[PDB]
């Protein structure tokens, strides 16, 4: 019985009871998992930030319950892995959660397992819903950033094949993420490989990207309300005759050079 704004403080309260939670509290955590995921795709950005920080601190909390950190994080992942199975919105939620978790505990998951998730995300690249494919593209970008190029190389072809047969409209909508992914792949690998295994139309974008990689190599009112050799020039002022021996002569020696709408019938201005 928690309302939508009330998710934003509550997670923090949950956060405030994670970082000293004892080892005999796993049931509470595994009951809290879906709330944290649904709050990672909450309406409020503050609730999303709180749920992401709660996920990070909660994964940190499993780094204290066992001797093996990698096995504990594997358990933490398999507590959230079913989220890729149910309804479309919560699948997108869980892909976003895995995207956030992949950037924090980078090597500690174990790259091969990450590769399996990447393969699953490739299946999630074939979804009809735009949010799921967007979250899959975000996870792909995070994986390209994080996990190693030597392990990327055996999985370049599958992920970019899942990219290639996306759609016409879906490719047209998210051309930004596709452009950034192609730029990252061209930076990290050979341009000829990406050209060889992509279909025809994307090649056009590629050469533009390649050309891009060619191209990359005081408090006064009047001053504030403004439309936004040489320093040795002096101006005298000539009044009484100028007395160079007067102590107050420096006031007469200056250092700089001295010196759109239509109105309506009522008189109010017109702004457009």
């Amino acid at each position: 019985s928690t309302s939508s704004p009330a998710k934003r403080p509550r997670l923090k309260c949950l956060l405030h009871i994670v970082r000293k939670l004892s080892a005999e509290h796993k049931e509470f955590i595994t009951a809290l998992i879906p709330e944290v995921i649904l709050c990672t795709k909450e309406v409020s950005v503050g609730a999303r930030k709180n749920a992401f920080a709660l996920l990070v601190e909660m994964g940190h909390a499993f780094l204290r319950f066992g001797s093996n950190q990698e096995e504990a994080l594997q358990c933490y992942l398999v507590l959230i892995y079913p989220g890729l199975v149910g309804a479309v919105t919560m699948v997108s939620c869980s892909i976003l959660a895995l995207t956030h978790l992949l950037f924090e505990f980078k090597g500690l998951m174990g790259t091969s397992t990450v590769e399996q998730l990447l393969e699953n995300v490739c299946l999630l690249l074939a979804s009809r819903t735009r949010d799921v494919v967007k979250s899959a593209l975000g996870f792909i970008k995070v994986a390209v950033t994080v996990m190693d190029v030597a392990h990327l190389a055996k999985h370049v072809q599958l992920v970019m094949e899942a990219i290639g047969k996306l759609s016409d409209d879906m490719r047209r909508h998210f051309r930004m993420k596709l452009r950034n992914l192609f730029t990252k792949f061209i930076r990290k690998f050979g341009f000829e490989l990406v050209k060889r295994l992509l279909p025809e139309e994307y090649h056009r974008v590629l050469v533009n990207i390649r050309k891009a990689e060619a191209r990359a190599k005081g408090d006064s009112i009047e001053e504030i309300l403004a439309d936004s050799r040489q320093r040795s020039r002096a101006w005298l002022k000539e009044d009484e005759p100028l007395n160079f021996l007067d102590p107050k002569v420096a006031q007469r020696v200056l250092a700089t050079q001295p010196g759109g709408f239509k109105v309506s019938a009522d008189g109010r201005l017109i702004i457009r």
Binding site: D219, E222, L269
Partner: protein, 81 residues
């Protein structure tokens, strides 16, 4: 969020013609924004109100001599018409 040209040039001219009727807080800036300018776009009106609130919290910390001579000039222009 980054800033544009039209909102801030409109704010500059609206201050240069009606600095007397502005206030210090956001709501009075909003009210004078409806009652002075027609401003058909609500987004542009909101941005104008935000930047004029920024301007009023900025220039009121400055010297009073410029404010006094600007009020004299505005009162002279109002009395001339």
């Amino acid at each position: 969020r980054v800033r544009t040209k039209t909102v801030k040039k409109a704010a500059r001219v609206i201050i240069e013609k009606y600095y007397t009727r502005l206030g210090n807080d956001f709501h009075t800036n909003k009210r004078v924004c409806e009652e002075i300018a027609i401003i058909p776009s609500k987004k542009l009106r909101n941005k104008i109100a935000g930047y004029v609130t920024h301007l009023m919290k900025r220039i009121q910390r400055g010297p009073v001599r410029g404010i006094s001579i600007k009020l004299q000039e505005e009162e002279r222009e109002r009395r001339d018409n």
